[PDB]
Design a protein around this ligand. Sequence first.
Ligand SMILES: OC[C@H]1O[C@@H](S[C@H]2[C@H](O)[C@@H](O)[C@H](O)O[C@@H]2CO)[C@H](O)[C@@H](O)[C@@H]1O
Ligand code: CS
Length: 445
Amino acid sequence: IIFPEDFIWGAATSSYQIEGAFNEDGKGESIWDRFSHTPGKIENGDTGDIACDHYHLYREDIELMKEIGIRSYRFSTSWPRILPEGKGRVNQKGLDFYKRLVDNLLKANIRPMITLYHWDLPQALQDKGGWTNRDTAKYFAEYARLMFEEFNGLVDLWVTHNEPWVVAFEGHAFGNHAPGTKDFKTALQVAHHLLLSHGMAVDIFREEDLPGEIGITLNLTPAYPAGDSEKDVKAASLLDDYINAWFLSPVFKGSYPEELHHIYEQNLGAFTTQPGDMDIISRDIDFLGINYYSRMVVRHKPGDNLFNAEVVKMEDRPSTEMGWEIYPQGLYDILVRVNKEYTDKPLYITENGAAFDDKLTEEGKIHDEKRINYLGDHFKQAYKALKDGVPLRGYYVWSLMDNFEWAYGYSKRFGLIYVDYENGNRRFLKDSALWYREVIEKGQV
Ligand SMILES: OC[C@H]1O[C@@H](S[C@H]2[C@H](O)[C@@H](O)[C@H](O)O[C@@H]2CO)[C@H](O)[C@@H](O)[C@@H]1O
Ligand SMILES: [Cs+]
């Protein structure tokens, strides 16, 4: 179990989850500022107002990155911190923060990967319809161009979008995430525009002629039927397409998955598209980022979804604090499936990790054995994928540090680093952090 010498071992975060400084130095309001300040939306009424205060503490966080020995740091940039209204004026202090951050990363020999959109849409753009407005895709493209030009020669790994499935469906169908809408047709229109905006950014990446590589990051959850019933098998297949193929087929094949597209259209009516959209959505990219956490086991059951599909709770199997099944085999399955059915391009696991009930000792120790076991077990499946020909180039752990976990607030801890919010926001390396350092150095698990 030795990994390639040049394998990119990293850790990942996102802007709203760690930065804080929510209305400081010219920053505009995001849909997540608004959502978290709306009653009943976040566990315990938590907000990302301060979070980990990374906006002020970034220099200390980079020292901690150095202690862990990560080769690359994946982070997202806040669109409303840079263009407060989404379009219009640039906020120079906002841009300046990311410039300092990138400079500091490069001086520590840490390779930056930027995610352009990790869910924090400017509220001014939401007031004009947000992702159901085709113009939002244009403004995203303009924001991308601004960042490409600013970091030309400085950042060589770029991700347009993080988890467009979640943005579309949790944000607009089920209303669990900002902006809180609950309309399945809206979600489908939003998915289309996220994909369009991705392709528009790729076109701009090519034109600007930056050194480096661009991709998109998709959450992928492989589905398994509960039993050999073909109704079970069909239901699993449909749920699987609903999360996975719905984004993988347009990016790589230039079409929505046919059976699912037909079912949506017949029952809901068509969402609005223009001729040529699929050509834009399917522009050639340099890599695919995969975010993996768990699988779903699926059976056929009466439900208020078009699939009559139920996700089965696997009560008999180890799970995390999220209640998610621990199923490392799924990581192998999904990497192999992508490489066979969709693309021969390089792959990166841009997220994988776990929440456990972390206990900070009086001396600042966190003995997170369960996270070490979780990470090592998934590392081994990644190795197995490499052994079998999958061009896996790197692996970023979610997350570098504990943070604002959206609707769960601070109650869920995914970090390699413990953040003691109550006591000056001090950081403590968990045992998994020093265990990870050993993995990176030896290239072995
Ligand atoms: O979306 C499901 C569930 O995910 C967890 S973890 C989450 C990270 O917070 C997000 O930044 C990353 O890109 O994706 C993973 C999976 O979506 C999140 O804490 C929780 O609120 C959310 O409901
Ligand atoms: Cs049909």
